[PDB]
Structures are given as structure tokens and as C-alpha cells.
């Protein structure tokens, strides 16, 4: 469907999650006028790739906390925590 809603769980690595994020409140939108947090890069054969994350996915929630209204730095901080796993709910435009 138009927006596929997926729940993806990244098994963290000492090198991180293997993704780059773009966007955030007050920053230049990744697409349209949407200030949300988006996956802009996925490292091939990295943790996020193994978890099924894809470029263009919109990040709605990280470890059960909404990113609604999040500035870029908040999203970065949310993804640089100590947990060995990162659960994210994303919307994927098909």
C-alpha cells in the first residue's frame, strides 16, 4: 500500500547501526516540506541492512518513543544510545 508501516529491529554493532539519517525540525526537509527523520543511507551488509531498513524510510518511533517534532540532534542522540538493539517503526512509500 501507499505507506507500508514496518517495525524493524537493528542489532547494534560496535561500529553503530549502519545508517545515516536526514531531516529534523528546523532543518532542510529530506523530501517535500516534511521535517521528519528519514533514512538517507544504509550501509550494505551492515546491521540496518540485515534488519531490513531501506533508504527513504521515515522514522516514526525509536525504542517506543515517538520522534514527532524531533530536531535532527534529538534523533541522532536517540540512535546513539547504549542498547544492544534499536527498535524502529517506519513508514515506507511503495
Amino acid at each position: 500500500i501507499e505507506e507500508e508501516e514496518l517495525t524493524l529491529t537493528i542489532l547494534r554493532q560496535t561500529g553503530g547501526l549502519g545508517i545515516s539519517i536526514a531531516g529534523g525540525k528546523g532543518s532542510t526537509p529530506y523530501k517535500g516540506d516534511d521535517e521528519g527523520i528519514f533514512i538517507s543511507r544504509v550501509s550494505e551488509e551492515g546491521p540496518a541492512a540485515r534488519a531490513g531498513v531501506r533508504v527513504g524510510d521515515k522514522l516514526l518511533e525509536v525504542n517506543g518513543v515517538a520522534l514527532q517534532g524531533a530536531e535532527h540532534h534529538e534523533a541522532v542522540e536517540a540512535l546513539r544510545g547504549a542498547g544492544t538493539a534499536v527498535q524502529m517503526r517506519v513508514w515506507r512509500e511503495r
Binding site: 553503530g16 547501526l17 545508517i19 545515516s20 539519517i21 536526514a22 531531516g23 529534523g24 528546523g26 532543518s27 532542510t28 538517507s40 543511507r41 535532527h72 541522532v76 540512535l79 546513539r80
Partner: peptide, 8 residues
């Protein structure tokens, strides 16, 4: 504004 990207 600025188009921010951060590797994570």
C-alpha cells in the same frame, strides 16, 4: 536552513 545528514 541546512540539509543535515549524520552517520549513526
Amino acid at each position: 536552513g541546512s540539509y543535515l545528514v549524520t552517520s549513526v
